[PDB]
Amino acid sequence: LDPLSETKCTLKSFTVEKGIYQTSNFRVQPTESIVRFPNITNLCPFDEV
Amino acid sequence: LPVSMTKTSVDCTMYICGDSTECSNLLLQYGSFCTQLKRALTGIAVEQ
Ligand SMILES: *[C@@H]1O[C@H](CO)[C@@H](O)[C@H](O)[C@H]1NC(C)=O
C-alpha cells in the first residue's frame, strides 16, 4: 500500500530507524508489441493449378 | 596505495531470469539467496 510499508516488510519489523533501505526494483513494462519480417515478395503457383 | 573500489549492485532476478516471469516463479522455490547477496554487496558498498 505505501512506500514505508515496503520498508517495514523488508526489515521484518513494525519500526524502521532513520536511513536509506533498498526496498524494491522499478521496471518499465512493454507497452504495445511489434513483429516485423521482410516483404512477403514471391507468391508460388497454386494459381496456375 | 589503493583506498577504495567500485561499489556495485546486482539485481538477482534480471540476471538469473531476465524478462521471463515463469523463471521468476521457479526462482522463489530456491530461497533467500537473493537477500543475502544484496546484504553482502550492500555491506561491501557502505564500507567503501
Ligand atoms: C482467380 O483469379 C481471380 C481474378 O482473376 C481472383 O480473384 C481469385 O482469387 C483467383 N483465385 C486463385 C486461386 O488464383
mmCIF file of N, CA and C and ligand atoms in Angstrom:
data_model
loop_
_atom_site.group_PDB
_atom_site.id
_atom_site.type_symbol
_atom_site.label_atom_id
_atom_site.label_comp_id
_atom_site.label_asym_id
_atom_site.label_seq_id
_atom_site.Cartn_x
_atom_site.Cartn_y
_atom_site.Cartn_z
ATOM 1 N N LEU A 1 0.818 -1.235 0.000
ATOM 2 C CA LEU A 1 0.000 0.000 0.000
ATOM 3 C C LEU A 1 0.844 1.275 0.000
ATOM 4 N N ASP A 2 1.942 1.329 0.752
ATOM 5 C CA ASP A 2 2.668 2.610 0.948
ATOM 6 C C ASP A 2 4.153 2.404 0.715
ATOM 7 N N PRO A 3 4.975 3.446 0.466
ATOM 8 C CA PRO A 3 6.408 3.244 0.388
ATOM 9 C C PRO A 3 6.930 2.756 1.742
ATOM 10 N N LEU A 4 6.500 3.354 2.853
ATOM 11 C CA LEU A 4 7.071 2.978 4.176
ATOM 12 C C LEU A 4 6.760 1.520 4.476
ATOM 13 N N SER A 5 5.585 1.047 4.111
ATOM 14 C CA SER A 5 5.198 -0.324 4.481
ATOM 15 C C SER A 5 6.145 -1.295 3.805
ATOM 16 N N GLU A 6 6.618 -0.981 2.610
ATOM 17 C CA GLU A 6 7.614 -1.890 1.999
ATOM 18 C C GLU A 6 8.879 -1.912 2.861
ATOM 19 N N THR A 7 9.296 -0.771 3.404
ATOM 20 C CA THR A 7 10.473 -0.729 4.307
ATOM 21 C C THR A 7 10.194 -1.540 5.569
ATOM 22 N N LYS A 8 8.991 -1.456 6.134
ATOM 23 C CA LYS A 8 8.637 -2.247 7.343
ATOM 24 C C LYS A 8 8.713 -3.734 7.013
ATOM 25 N N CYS A 9 8.192 -4.142 5.870
ATOM 26 C CA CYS A 9 8.192 -5.568 5.480
ATOM 27 C C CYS A 9 9.610 -6.055 5.216
ATOM 28 N N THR A 10 10.450 -5.232 4.590
ATOM 29 C CA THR A 10 11.829 -5.650 4.231
ATOM 30 C C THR A 10 12.629 -5.882 5.504
ATOM 31 N N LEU A 11 12.474 -4.996 6.474
ATOM 32 C CA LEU A 11 13.230 -5.103 7.737
ATOM 33 C C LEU A 11 12.534 -6.138 8.624
ATOM 34 N N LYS A 12 11.344 -6.612 8.248
ATOM 35 C CA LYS A 12 10.529 -7.573 9.052
ATOM 36 C C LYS A 12 10.211 -6.975 10.416
ATOM 37 N N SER A 13 9.966 -5.673 10.476
ATOM 38 C CA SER A 13 9.752 -5.002 11.771
ATOM 39 C C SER A 13 8.658 -3.956 11.632
ATOM 40 N N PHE A 14 8.048 -3.547 12.739
ATOM 41 C CA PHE A 14 6.982 -2.519 12.712
ATOM 42 C C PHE A 14 7.568 -1.150 12.991
ATOM 43 N N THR A 15 8.864 -1.094 13.278
ATOM 44 C CA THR A 15 9.554 0.205 13.477
ATOM 45 C C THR A 15 10.708 0.253 12.490
ATOM 46 N N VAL A 16 10.883 1.366 11.788
ATOM 47 C CA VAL A 16 12.070 1.489 10.904
ATOM 48 C C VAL A 16 12.894 2.677 11.412
ATOM 49 N N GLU A 17 14.206 2.520 11.531
ATOM 50 C CA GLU A 17 15.071 3.603 12.048
ATOM 51 C C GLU A 17 15.538 4.460 10.877
ATOM 52 N N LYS A 18 16.117 5.633 11.126
ATOM 53 C CA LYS A 18 16.466 6.562 10.026
ATOM 54 C C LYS A 18 17.501 5.942 9.116
ATOM 55 N N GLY A 19 17.299 6.029 7.800
ATOM 56 C CA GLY A 19 18.310 5.540 6.849
ATOM 57 C C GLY A 19 17.748 5.358 5.466
ATOM 58 N N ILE A 20 18.535 4.828 4.526
ATOM 59 C CA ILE A 20 18.021 4.503 3.166
ATOM 60 C C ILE A 20 18.027 2.990 3.025
ATOM 61 N N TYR A 21 16.863 2.399 2.799
ATOM 62 C CA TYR A 21 16.733 0.935 2.737
ATOM 63 C C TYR A 21 16.296 0.559 1.334
ATOM 64 N N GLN A 22 16.945 -0.416 0.714
ATOM 65 C CA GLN A 22 16.640 -0.748 -0.694
ATOM 66 C C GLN A 22 15.454 -1.687 -0.704
ATOM 67 N N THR A 23 14.253 -1.125 -0.685
ATOM 68 C CA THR A 23 13.000 -1.909 -0.623
ATOM 69 C C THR A 23 12.691 -2.729 -1.872
ATOM 70 N N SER A 24 12.899 -2.192 -3.068
ATOM 71 C CA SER A 24 12.401 -2.915 -4.256
ATOM 72 C C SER A 24 13.059 -2.491 -5.557
ATOM 73 N N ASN A 25 12.585 -3.041 -6.677
ATOM 74 C CA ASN A 25 13.128 -2.737 -8.023
ATOM 75 C C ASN A 25 12.034 -2.124 -8.897
ATOM 76 N N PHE A 26 12.371 -1.164 -9.753
ATOM 77 C CA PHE A 26 11.398 -0.475 -10.627
ATOM 78 C C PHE A 26 11.705 -0.895 -12.051
ATOM 79 N N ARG A 27 10.748 -1.494 -12.756
ATOM 80 C CA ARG A 27 10.955 -1.882 -14.172
ATOM 81 C C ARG A 27 9.823 -1.346 -15.044
ATOM 82 N N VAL A 28 10.135 -0.628 -16.121
ATOM 83 C CA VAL A 28 9.075 -0.190 -17.072
ATOM 84 C C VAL A 28 8.636 -1.424 -17.855
ATOM 85 N N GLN A 29 7.340 -1.586 -18.105
ATOM 86 C CA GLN A 29 6.848 -2.843 -18.726
ATOM 87 C C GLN A 29 6.506 -2.607 -20.196
ATOM 88 N N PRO A 30 6.633 -3.612 -21.085
ATOM 89 C CA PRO A 30 6.438 -3.390 -22.507
ATOM 90 C C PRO A 30 5.044 -2.829 -22.779
ATOM 91 N N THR A 31 4.928 -1.914 -23.742
ATOM 92 C CA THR A 31 3.628 -1.241 -23.982
ATOM 93 C C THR A 31 2.789 -1.843 -25.112
ATOM 94 N N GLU A 32 3.348 -2.073 -26.309
ATOM 95 C CA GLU A 32 2.489 -2.490 -27.454
ATOM 96 C C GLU A 32 2.808 -3.871 -28.013
ATOM 97 N N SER A 33 4.008 -4.087 -28.557
ATOM 98 C CA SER A 33 4.424 -5.347 -29.242
ATOM 99 C C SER A 33 4.389 -5.167 -30.766
ATOM 100 N N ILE A 34 5.547 -5.245 -31.431
ATOM 101 C CA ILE A 34 5.655 -5.080 -32.907
ATOM 102 C C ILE A 34 6.448 -6.261 -33.463
ATOM 103 N N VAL A 35 5.929 -6.937 -34.483
ATOM 104 C CA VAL A 35 6.688 -8.040 -35.141
ATOM 105 C C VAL A 35 6.898 -7.648 -36.601
ATOM 106 N N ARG A 36 8.144 -7.572 -37.052
ATOM 107 C CA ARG A 36 8.402 -7.106 -38.428
ATOM 108 C C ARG A 36 9.268 -8.130 -39.148
ATOM 109 N N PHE A 37 8.781 -8.644 -40.273
ATOM 110 C CA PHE A 37 9.552 -9.610 -41.093
ATOM 111 C C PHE A 37 9.866 -8.904 -42.416
ATOM 112 N N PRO A 38 10.681 -9.472 -43.330
ATOM 113 C CA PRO A 38 10.921 -8.848 -44.630
ATOM 114 C C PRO A 38 9.680 -8.931 -45.526
ATOM 115 N N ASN A 39 9.670 -8.196 -46.640
ATOM 116 C CA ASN A 39 8.463 -8.135 -47.507
ATOM 117 C C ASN A 39 8.098 -9.543 -47.964
ATOM 118 N N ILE A 40 6.797 -9.825 -48.089
ATOM 119 C CA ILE A 40 6.339 -11.200 -48.446
ATOM 120 C C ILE A 40 6.936 -11.567 -49.805
ATOM 121 N N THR A 41 6.988 -10.615 -50.741
ATOM 122 C CA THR A 41 7.650 -10.851 -52.056
ATOM 123 C C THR A 41 7.020 -12.011 -52.831
ATOM 124 N N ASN A 42 7.805 -13.036 -53.171
ATOM 125 C CA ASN A 42 7.322 -14.116 -54.076
ATOM 126 C C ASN A 42 6.088 -14.876 -53.581
ATOM 127 N N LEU A 43 5.127 -15.121 -54.479
ATOM 128 C CA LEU A 43 3.940 -15.967 -54.174
ATOM 129 C C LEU A 43 4.061 -17.083 -55.207
ATOM 130 N N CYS A 44 3.862 -18.359 -54.818
ATOM 131 C CA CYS A 44 4.134 -19.555 -55.686
ATOM 132 C C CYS A 44 3.032 -19.901 -56.689
ATOM 133 N N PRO A 45 3.135 -20.966 -57.553
ATOM 134 C CA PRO A 45 1.991 -21.216 -58.413
ATOM 135 C C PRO A 45 0.821 -22.122 -58.042
ATOM 136 N N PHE A 46 0.152 -21.860 -56.922
ATOM 137 C CA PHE A 46 -1.110 -22.590 -56.670
ATOM 138 C C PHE A 46 -2.067 -22.040 -57.725
ATOM 139 N N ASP A 47 -1.914 -20.755 -58.063
ATOM 140 C CA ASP A 47 -2.817 -20.070 -59.024
ATOM 141 C C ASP A 47 -2.760 -20.761 -60.379
ATOM 142 N N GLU A 48 -1.585 -21.202 -60.786
ATOM 143 C CA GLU A 48 -1.500 -21.949 -62.056
ATOM 144 C C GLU A 48 -2.212 -23.300 -61.919
ATOM 145 N N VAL A 49 -2.455 -23.805 -60.698
ATOM 146 C CA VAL A 49 -3.233 -25.080 -60.574
ATOM 147 C C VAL A 49 -4.730 -24.824 -60.334
ATOM 148 N N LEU B 1 48.842 3.929 -2.832
ATOM 149 C CA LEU B 1 48.117 2.867 -2.094
ATOM 150 C C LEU B 1 46.672 2.853 -2.570
ATOM 151 N N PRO B 2 45.999 1.708 -2.752
ATOM 152 C CA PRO B 2 44.591 1.731 -3.094
ATOM 153 C C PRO B 2 43.563 1.832 -1.956
ATOM 154 N N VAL B 3 42.942 2.994 -1.681
ATOM 155 C CA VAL B 3 41.894 3.188 -0.624
ATOM 156 C C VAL B 3 40.521 2.544 -0.855
ATOM 157 N N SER B 4 39.934 2.558 -2.043
ATOM 158 C CA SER B 4 38.540 2.092 -2.242
ATOM 159 C C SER B 4 38.361 1.375 -3.569
ATOM 160 N N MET B 5 37.212 0.741 -3.768
ATOM 161 C CA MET B 5 36.925 0.039 -5.029
ATOM 162 C C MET B 5 35.515 0.391 -5.482
ATOM 163 N N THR B 6 35.124 -0.018 -6.677
ATOM 164 C CA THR B 6 33.787 0.291 -7.242
ATOM 165 C C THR B 6 32.690 -0.374 -6.422
ATOM 166 N N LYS B 7 31.618 0.367 -6.154
ATOM 167 C CA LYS B 7 30.512 -0.148 -5.344
ATOM 168 C C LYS B 7 29.532 -0.596 -6.390
ATOM 169 N N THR B 8 29.179 -1.867 -6.421
ATOM 170 C CA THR B 8 28.311 -2.375 -7.495
ATOM 171 C C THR B 8 27.103 -3.025 -6.853
ATOM 172 N N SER B 9 25.983 -3.069 -7.555
ATOM 173 C CA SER B 9 24.779 -3.758 -7.059
ATOM 174 C C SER B 9 24.325 -4.659 -8.196
ATOM 175 N N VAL B 10 23.828 -5.854 -7.890
ATOM 176 C CA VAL B 10 23.315 -6.763 -8.948
ATOM 177 C C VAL B 10 21.859 -7.071 -8.641
ATOM 178 N N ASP B 11 20.999 -7.085 -9.662
ATOM 179 C CA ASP B 11 19.585 -7.487 -9.449
ATOM 180 C C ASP B 11 19.529 -8.981 -9.710
ATOM 181 N N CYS B 12 19.224 -9.765 -8.691
ATOM 182 C CA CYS B 12 19.305 -11.213 -8.925
ATOM 183 C C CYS B 12 18.306 -11.592 -10.007
ATOM 184 N N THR B 13 17.070 -11.095 -9.946
ATOM 185 C CA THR B 13 16.044 -11.575 -10.914
ATOM 186 C C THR B 13 16.403 -11.202 -12.349
ATOM 187 N N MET B 14 16.820 -9.971 -12.612
ATOM 188 C CA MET B 14 17.122 -9.670 -14.023
ATOM 189 C C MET B 14 18.268 -10.576 -14.453
ATOM 190 N N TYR B 15 19.288 -10.740 -13.615
ATOM 191 C CA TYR B 15 20.451 -11.535 -14.075
ATOM 192 C C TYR B 15 20.067 -13.002 -14.253
ATOM 193 N N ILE B 16 19.433 -13.606 -13.256
ATOM 194 C CA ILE B 16 19.177 -15.070 -13.329
ATOM 195 C C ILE B 16 18.137 -15.378 -14.398
ATOM 196 N N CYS B 17 17.076 -14.576 -14.485
ATOM 197 C CA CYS B 17 15.989 -14.836 -15.462
ATOM 198 C C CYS B 17 16.059 -13.781 -16.550
ATOM 199 N N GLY B 18 15.411 -12.648 -16.332
ATOM 200 C CA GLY B 18 15.513 -11.548 -17.302
ATOM 201 C C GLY B 18 14.368 -11.610 -18.276
ATOM 202 N N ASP B 19 13.339 -10.786 -18.079
ATOM 203 C CA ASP B 19 12.153 -10.755 -18.982
ATOM 204 C C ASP B 19 11.547 -12.159 -19.147
ATOM 205 N N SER B 20 11.454 -12.929 -18.060
ATOM 206 C CA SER B 20 10.841 -14.280 -18.089
ATOM 207 C C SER B 20 10.129 -14.518 -16.759
ATOM 208 N N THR B 21 8.842 -14.183 -16.670
ATOM 209 C CA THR B 21 8.102 -14.291 -15.384
ATOM 210 C C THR B 21 8.083 -15.738 -14.902
ATOM 211 N N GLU B 22 7.996 -16.688 -15.829
ATOM 212 C CA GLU B 22 7.948 -18.123 -15.464
ATOM 213 C C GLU B 22 9.227 -18.473 -14.695
ATOM 214 N N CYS B 23 10.375 -17.931 -15.110
ATOM 215 C CA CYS B 23 11.638 -18.185 -14.367
ATOM 216 C C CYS B 23 11.546 -17.581 -12.967
ATOM 217 N N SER B 24 10.989 -16.376 -12.850
ATOM 218 C CA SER B 24 10.951 -15.702 -11.528
ATOM 219 C C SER B 24 10.142 -16.574 -10.564
ATOM 220 N N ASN B 25 9.065 -17.187 -11.063
ATOM 221 C CA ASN B 25 8.217 -18.067 -10.219
ATOM 222 C C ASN B 25 9.058 -19.247 -9.728
ATOM 223 N N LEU B 26 9.842 -19.853 -10.621
ATOM 224 C CA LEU B 26 10.711 -21.001 -10.246
ATOM 225 C C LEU B 26 11.784 -20.558 -9.246
ATOM 226 N N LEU B 27 12.313 -19.341 -9.390
ATOM 227 C CA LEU B 27 13.447 -18.891 -8.537
ATOM 228 C C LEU B 27 13.058 -18.867 -7.058
ATOM 229 N N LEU B 28 11.816 -18.503 -6.736
ATOM 230 C CA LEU B 28 11.445 -18.356 -5.302
ATOM 231 C C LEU B 28 11.657 -19.691 -4.590
ATOM 232 N N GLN B 29 11.321 -20.803 -5.250
ATOM 233 C CA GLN B 29 11.455 -22.153 -4.635
ATOM 234 C C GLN B 29 12.903 -22.397 -4.193
ATOM 235 N N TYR B 30 13.856 -21.604 -4.698
ATOM 236 C CA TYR B 30 15.287 -21.757 -4.317
ATOM 237 C C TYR B 30 15.573 -21.150 -2.939
ATOM 238 N N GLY B 31 15.046 -19.966 -2.630
ATOM 239 C CA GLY B 31 15.282 -19.499 -1.253
ATOM 240 C C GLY B 31 15.582 -18.029 -1.047
ATOM 241 N N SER B 32 16.318 -17.727 0.026
ATOM 242 C CA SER B 32 16.624 -16.326 0.408
ATOM 243 C C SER B 32 17.994 -15.916 -0.133
ATOM 244 N N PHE B 33 18.519 -16.654 -1.108
ATOM 245 C CA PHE B 33 19.881 -16.345 -1.586
ATOM 246 C C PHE B 33 19.902 -14.908 -2.093
ATOM 247 N N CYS B 34 18.850 -14.443 -2.746
ATOM 248 C CA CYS B 34 18.954 -13.070 -3.275
ATOM 249 C C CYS B 34 19.128 -12.128 -2.104
ATOM 250 N N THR B 35 18.438 -12.370 -0.998
ATOM 251 C CA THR B 35 18.514 -11.385 0.116
ATOM 252 C C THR B 35 19.927 -11.299 0.680
ATOM 253 N N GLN B 36 20.583 -12.436 0.884
ATOM 254 C CA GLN B 36 21.967 -12.448 1.415
ATOM 255 C C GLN B 36 22.946 -11.829 0.417
ATOM 256 N N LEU B 37 22.762 -12.062 -0.876
ATOM 257 C CA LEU B 37 23.665 -11.481 -1.891
ATOM 258 C C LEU B 37 23.556 -9.961 -1.877
ATOM 259 N N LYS B 38 22.362 -9.411 -1.769
ATOM 260 C CA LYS B 38 22.190 -7.944 -1.668
ATOM 261 C C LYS B 38 22.743 -7.428 -0.351
ATOM 262 N N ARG B 39 22.560 -8.165 0.728
ATOM 263 C CA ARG B 39 23.114 -7.742 2.025
ATOM 264 C C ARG B 39 24.629 -7.732 1.919
ATOM 265 N N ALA B 40 25.216 -8.729 1.262
ATOM 266 C CA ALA B 40 26.683 -8.808 1.151
ATOM 267 C C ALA B 40 27.215 -7.634 0.348
ATOM 268 N N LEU B 41 26.640 -7.395 -0.834
ATOM 269 C CA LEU B 41 27.112 -6.295 -1.717
ATOM 270 C C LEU B 41 26.803 -4.930 -1.087
ATOM 271 N N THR B 42 25.726 -4.816 -0.298
ATOM 272 C CA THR B 42 25.450 -3.527 0.387
ATOM 273 C C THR B 42 26.477 -3.248 1.478
ATOM 274 N N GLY B 43 26.905 -4.255 2.214
ATOM 275 C CA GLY B 43 27.959 -4.043 3.216
ATOM 276 C C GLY B 43 29.286 -3.692 2.589
ATOM 277 N N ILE B 44 29.629 -4.345 1.489
ATOM 278 C CA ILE B 44 30.881 -4.004 0.780
ATOM 279 C C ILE B 44 30.737 -2.562 0.359
ATOM 280 N N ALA B 45 29.589 -2.152 -0.142
ATOM 281 C CA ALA B 45 29.387 -0.790 -0.661
ATOM 282 C C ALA B 45 29.417 0.293 0.412
ATOM 283 N N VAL B 46 28.845 0.092 1.588
ATOM 284 C CA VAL B 46 28.942 1.102 2.685
ATOM 285 C C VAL B 46 30.359 1.187 3.230
ATOM 286 N N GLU B 47 31.078 0.076 3.290
ATOM 287 C CA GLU B 47 32.475 0.057 3.770
ATOM 288 C C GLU B 47 33.280 0.912 2.824
ATOM 289 N N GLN B 48 32.985 0.877 1.534
ATOM 290 C CA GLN B 48 33.809 1.585 0.536
ATOM 291 C C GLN B 48 33.646 3.070 0.760
HETATM 292 C C1 LIG C 1 -8.506 -16.364 -59.619
HETATM 293 O O1 LIG C 1 -8.498 -15.083 -60.289
HETATM 294 C C2 LIG C 1 -9.351 -14.081 -59.709
HETATM 295 C C3 LIG C 1 -9.156 -12.825 -60.528
HETATM 296 O O2 LIG C 1 -8.830 -13.121 -61.880
HETATM 297 C C4 LIG C 1 -9.029 -13.888 -58.226
HETATM 298 O O3 LIG C 1 -9.969 -13.008 -57.620
HETATM 299 C C5 LIG C 1 -9.038 -15.221 -57.500
HETATM 300 O O4 LIG C 1 -8.619 -15.019 -56.158
HETATM 301 C C6 LIG C 1 -8.089 -16.181 -58.190
HETATM 302 N N1 LIG C 1 -8.031 -17.447 -57.493
HETATM 303 C C7 LIG C 1 -6.917 -18.176 -57.453
HETATM 304 C C8 LIG C 1 -6.997 -19.456 -56.688
HETATM 305 O O5 LIG C 1 -5.899 -17.825 -58.024
#
